[PDB]
Amino acid sequence: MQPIILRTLSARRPVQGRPNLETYTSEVERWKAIAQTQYALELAKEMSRPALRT
């Protein structure tokens, strides 16, 4: 058995840990706020109706 066969090649990924996601989390919170506004607008439209006219 004399062919050179390579068994354990190192991977592409680096050894470091996961970079933090604070800026991504902030932008996601911005999207959440935008999405909450579009439902809050409808419910607010509901809030401004007259009192006893059912």
Identity of the residue numbered 15: V
Which strand (E) or helix (H) includes residue 36?
helix 22-47
Q: Cβ of residue 54: shortest distance to other proteins, in angstroms?
A: 6
The reply to whether 52 sits near other proteins by the rule CB under 8 A is: no
Q: Cβ of residue 41: shortest distance to other proteins, in angstroms?
A: 13
Cα 40 vs. chain centroid, distance in angstroms?
Answer: 21
Of residues 21 and 40, the one with the C-beta less far from other proteins: 40
Cα 16 vs. chain centroid, distance in angstroms?
Answer: 22
Site residues for other proteins per CB under 8 A? 49-50, 53-54
